[PDB]
Design a protein around this ligand. Structure first.
Ligand SMILES: O=P(O)(O)O[C@H]1O[C@H](CO)[C@@H](O)[C@H](O)[C@H]1O
Length: 1108
């Protein structure tokens, strides 16, 4: 059976514009030239995000009626470039005429005829304003760079918008406003229009009130305009309009295109505008959100709770002894980002895995989005989740349940419980609880949905699936065969020709597309795979993925518990059975590490094996710098050494021929895709990681492995392998080649760690020097020197000379008045200027975090400089929510870049522009740990710990507690208010909120901080290093940890009165060893493996005595 693709059947066209609609008149794709104007494509069940709302005010009510789209019940006529919507609302006849003119200008002309006392209109439009590619790739990210300027025009508010991230060279533009009626209020983000409450009510919150008239620069670019209120007794007429320009290189300063708009307003098409058939839903109601559980219900279903989060004494979330995190309804209605989770199949932990299965789900009834097998972009069965508020709610796997006469789509449950192996939703019904579980199979490429009525009551269900079978919805035809209760789905390819999926469905279910939702049984979307299941108290759908066609029979039985238990052991072993305990009350911070470790282990494992996140659904590839940080640090900390060796070989095989640097990112599977343009820090990371591998393992053989390169343009193997050592030599030449003349100052080139600080021109590219890059290069080439020492003496000597020269240029050029400058700009020896240093008095930015922490971490900063670094942090960068990247925001003047690219283009205060990018705060922790500053280090660890965050950082707004957040951003509506009131961040006088979730190096590098740097357990070549940096409160606390395959119990004692720094005892015998080198403090102890293990055979409780 062949599934066709959805094509939007209403197709309006006019000079350089194609605007398409679904048959209910819902927006599909509005394209002007090559710019997509809307943010979200409509779907055949929900319609589209945009609308026009008629509201009617009475003495005891307010009513609101959508005028367009399939939720309006308007009839429709169309021409070549016109739609006419007609209908009535109470006592008002309306017509809405949509005009697509030749000018990249559209109108919604509204005519109202009737009697009523008080009415208004609300205009509502989601806006993307990017290429189709950019909008589809990430709506949220596109929104971040879409800057809105508000003016008063002839008819009140007019919203102008400039897209500040280049779209195929161009900076596109929108303008929206009203004609013939005053817009008396406006909003610019979907959070303002729909509100968080939408996630329960399914009703846009703004419809009950006035728009706020504030420009909120967030992630749901969404323009709303509210008319002045009016009486009706007769006919009233007015319009809304939009203008799209594909290139507006200047910043917005005023309302433009007034003459053009007047010309476009006079435009009407000559052709007949004729009736078209409009489909209508049949027995489909409003969505069903659960009633909220009260205290006694929660107590009943979850008798065993820990780490309870409460606000105003209402329970928001908690953890359980069985390693679950549970989220109550009320919490989801207070988090701006939607609670969600990623499931992933276990793999062999000694090799780079292939064909890993994964699925994403969210608390608000998105049960399974983006089911993939291997490649998280291309090898996909179910469509991606999009947005934040579930306005469009048809993606992936959804469930309809019959309540009374009507099928009703499940949205918000009473509770959502996550475990690393699965997600459970609890929906309160009338005298029943419906329990939905979506869970991963152990050892099998499967995700299973289970639906179960707690009281064994029967119901009718339709389970819908937005298929892709490929990277995108609506892109390709689908082969669907059915044998009994097994469906097989495959595309109708080049690198995964056997790609297929199977679903086992319940035994007397019926199969359709969206036809069953409609009165006429008309198919509109043929790729909506619908499963109607009648009169069942329970059922399941088993979903299998096969990237290489290794099809396996279904099991008879699919049991969540067994999977849960197998994954729990997998995760325990993954973190070497980490567990903190004490005889007395364990400290809260330890309790937080026990609860978070396996969650961060899961997040890190996803980042490694199945690279994608919640907001960042588009991934698939390894980032070169990323795989060297998050996964490698996680795996080196936990002794997954064979895995790191394999990672590193794969990594080196992706080095690019000719240029001999690395791509920014690359697919690690059979898809030859990479980004050959890289930032200037990227080359250092494979060099550092291989060195850290060699130091940890003694495995110098890796340097003799014969490994290929990839071609720049095609990402194909070059079939000219060389030893990894020679790979390294070539990389190192590229570094030497970046010396500025007369110096060993490494050119900035494409940028450093901070992806928002790409150089805005060629001169800045050539002549900037990043102090962080410089420090990283020094550290990397020193580590390289040591790692290669025993193998190639001469190269090791050259590496030493290089590191030394880089060190000398660092001290000689990048430091003034004891302050390490963020950057030096050097045209030549005669023309030099510090930036991100106090001397740059023309700039607002005088201090940069990155070099301060890298220089400490590398032991490059001498003790004095390192101590100065910490003072600079305390005085200029430390905030209650963590340490900031800079002491002031980057420039923003309407979106054109001057020095830095994306940092100067982002309209939204978020991601790196927030200045608290958590990854960098974790490096701060690493630096503190190097300096032995245990009180600052543990305090910093807690400030970014999502568990009970709001109890610890009073101005932090709550967020999902069992997942990593990548940034912390002040609640500032725009860049100008951010700059003006920046100091509020330092004193906690503005609230801060969480950024993007899960997909980051953060969780892995956090885990390393915990284990290696603070608890102080590090593995070396036939040695264990013991070097705790802990507080008095860890005194009497024990870490259980598996060391070289042996479970040990490290009990901490903090003794300020010791003669020595460190002492390690087993059965009262002091373990012999050597002190570690550390220029800032007394070093830890290196104990031989055989000695350590021998001691552990008799008494595996090791007592560590440490003085701060
Ligand atoms: O969001 P993440 O993964 O924590 O980190 C992201 O931003 C950082 C700062 O620009 C980069 O160094 C990473 O390569 C990128 O993935």
């Amino acid at each position: 059976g062949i599934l066709k693709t959805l094509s939007a059947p209403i197709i309006l066209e006019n000079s350089n514009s194609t605007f398409t609609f679904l048959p209910g008149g819902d927006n599909f794709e509005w394209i002007h030239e090559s710019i997509m104007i809307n943010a979200f494509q409509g779907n055949t069940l929900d319609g589209s995000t945009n609308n026009l709302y008629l509201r009617i005010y009475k003495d005891n009510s307010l009513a609101f009626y959508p005028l367009i789209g399939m939720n309006s019940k308007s009839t429709i006529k169309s021409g070549t470039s016109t739609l006419i919507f007609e209908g009535t609302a109470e006592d008002i006849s309306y017509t809405v005429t949509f005009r697509l003119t030749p000018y990249g200008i559209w109108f919604w002309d509204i005519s109202l005829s009737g009697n009523c006392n008080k009415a208004d209109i609300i205009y509502s439009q989601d806006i993307g304003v990017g290429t189709k590619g950019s909008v589809n790739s990430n709506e949220l990210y596109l929104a971040q760079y879409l800057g809105h300027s508000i003016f008063q025009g002839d008819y009140g508010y007019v919203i102008c918008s400039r897209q500040n991230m280049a779209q195929g060279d161009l900076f596109p533009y929108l303008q929206q406003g009203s004609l013939g009626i005053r817009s008396i209020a406006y909003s610019t983000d979907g959070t303002q229009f729909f509100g968080l409450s939408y996630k329960k009510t399914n009703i846009p919150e703004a419809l009950y009130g006035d728009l706020p008239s504030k420009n909120k620069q967030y992630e749901l670019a969404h323009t709303a305009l509210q008319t002045e209120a009016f009486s009706l007794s007769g006919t009233k007429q007015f319009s809304f309009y939009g203008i799209c320009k594909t290139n507006h290189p200047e910043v917005i300063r005023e309302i433009e295109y007034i003459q053009e708009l007047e010309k476009a307003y006079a435009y009407h098409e000559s052709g007949e505008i004729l009736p078209v058939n409009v489909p209508t839903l049949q027995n489909i109601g409003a969505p069903y959100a659960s009633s909220r559980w009260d205290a006694k219900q929660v107590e009943h279903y979850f008798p065993k709770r820990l780490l309870e989060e409460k606000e105003e004494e209402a329970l928001l979330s908690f953890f359980t002894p069985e390693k679950s995190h549970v989220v109550l309804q009320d919490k989801e209605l207070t988090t701006e980002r939607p609670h969600g989770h990623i499931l992933m199949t276990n793999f062999d932990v000694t090799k780079v895995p292939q064909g890993v299965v994964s699925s994403t789900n969210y608390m608000y009834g998105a049960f399974n989005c983006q089911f993939v097998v291997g490649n998280t972009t291309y090898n996909k069965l179910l469509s991606n989740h999009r947005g934040l508020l579930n306005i469009q709610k048809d993606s992936g796997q959804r469930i309809f349940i019959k309540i009374g006469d009507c099928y009703r789509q499940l949205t918000l449950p009473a509770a959502y419980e996550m475990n690393v192996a699965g997600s459970t939703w609890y929906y309160q019904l009338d005298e029943d609880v419906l329990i939905i579980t979506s869970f991963a199979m152990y050892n099998r490429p499967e995700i299973v949905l289970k639906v179960q009525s707690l009281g064994h009551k029967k119901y009718d269900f339709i389970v819908t699936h937005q298929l892709t079978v490929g990277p995108n919805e609506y892109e390709n035809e689908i082969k669907l065969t059915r044998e009994g209760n097994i469906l097989q789905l495959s595309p109708t390819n080049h690198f995964y020709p056997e790609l297929s999926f199977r679903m086992r469905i319940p035994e007397d279910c019926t199969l359709s597309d969206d036809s069953i939702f409609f009165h006429n049984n008309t198919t509109i979307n043929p790729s909506l795979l619908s499963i109607e299941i009648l009169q069942k108290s329970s059922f399941d759908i088993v979903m299998q993925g096969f990237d290489t066609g290794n099809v396996i029979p279904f099991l008879d039985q699919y049991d969540y518990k067994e999977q849960l238990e197998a994954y729990r052991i997998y995760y325990d072993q993954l973190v070497c059975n980490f567990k903190l305990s004490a005889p007395d009350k364990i400290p809260l911070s330890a309790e937080k590490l026990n609860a978070i470790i396996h969650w961060y282990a899961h997040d890190a494992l996803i980042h490694f094996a199945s690279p994608h996140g919640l907001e960042q659904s588009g991934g698939a590839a390894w980032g070169t710098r990323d795989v060297c940080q998050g996964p490698i640090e996680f795996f080196l900390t936990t002794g997954h050494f064979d895995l790191v060796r394999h990672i590193l070989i794969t990594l080196y095989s992706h080095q690019i021929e000719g240029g001999f640097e690395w791509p920014q990112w690359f697919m690690f599977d059979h898809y030859p895709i990479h980004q050959e343009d890289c930032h200037g820090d990227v080359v250092f990371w494979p060099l550092k990681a291989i060195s850290d591998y060699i130091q940890a393992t003694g495995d110098t053989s890796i340097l003799n492995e014969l490994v290929d390169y990839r071609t720049a343009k095609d990402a194909l193997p070059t079939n000219q392998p060389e030893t990894i050592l020679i790979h390294i030599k070539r990389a190192v030449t590229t570094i030497k080649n970046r010396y500025l003349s007369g110096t060993a100052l490494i050119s900035y080139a494409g940028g450093d760690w901070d992806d928002t600080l790409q150089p805005a021109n060629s001169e800045l590219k050539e002549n900037l020097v990043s102090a962080w890059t410089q420090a990283l290069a020094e550290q990397t080439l020193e580590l390289l020197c040591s790692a290669i020492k025993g193998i190639d003496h001469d190269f090791s000597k050259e590496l030493s000379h290089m590191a030394n020269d880089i060190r000398t240029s660092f001290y000689q050029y990048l430091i003034k008045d004891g302050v390490i400058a963020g950057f030096l700009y050097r045209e030549s020896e005669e023309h030099m200027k510090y930036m991100l240093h106090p001397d740059d008095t023309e700039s607002s930015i005088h201090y940069r975090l990155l070099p301060l922490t890298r220089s400490i971490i590398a032991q490059l900063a001498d003790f004095k400089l390192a101590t100065r670094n910490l003072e600079i942090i305390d005085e200029h960068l430390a905030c209650p929510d963590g340490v900031r990247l800079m002491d002031h925001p980057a420039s923003y003047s309407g979106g054109i870049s001057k020095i830095f690219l994306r940092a100067e283009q982002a309209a939204n205060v978020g991601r790196e522009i927030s200045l608290q990018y958590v990854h960098a705060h974790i490096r701060y922790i690493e630096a503190l740990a190097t300096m032995g500053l245990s009180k600052k280090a543990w305090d910093a660890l807690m400030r970014i710990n999502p568990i009970l965050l709001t109890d610890y950082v009073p101005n932090a707004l709550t967020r999902q507690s069992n997942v990593y957040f990548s940034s912390s951003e002040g609640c500032f509506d725009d860049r100008y208010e951010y700059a003006k009131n920046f100091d509020k961040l330092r004193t906690g006088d503005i609230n801060v909120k969480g950024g993007w979730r899960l997909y980051s190096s953060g969780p892995g590098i956090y885990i390393r901080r915990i284990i290696a740097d603070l608890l102080g357990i590090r593995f070396g070549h036939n040695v264990i290093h013991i070097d705790p940096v802990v507080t008095k409160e860890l005194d009497g606390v024990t870490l259980q940890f598996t060391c070289f395959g042996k479970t040990v119990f490290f009990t901490y004692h903090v003794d300020d009165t010791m003669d020595k720094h460190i002492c390690v005892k087993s059965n009262n015998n002091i373990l012999p060893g050597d002190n570690l080198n550390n220029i800032y403090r007394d070093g830890g102890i290196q104990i031989a493996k055989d000695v350590f293990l021998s001691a552990a055979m008799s008494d595996n409780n090791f007592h560590i005595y440490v003085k701060n």
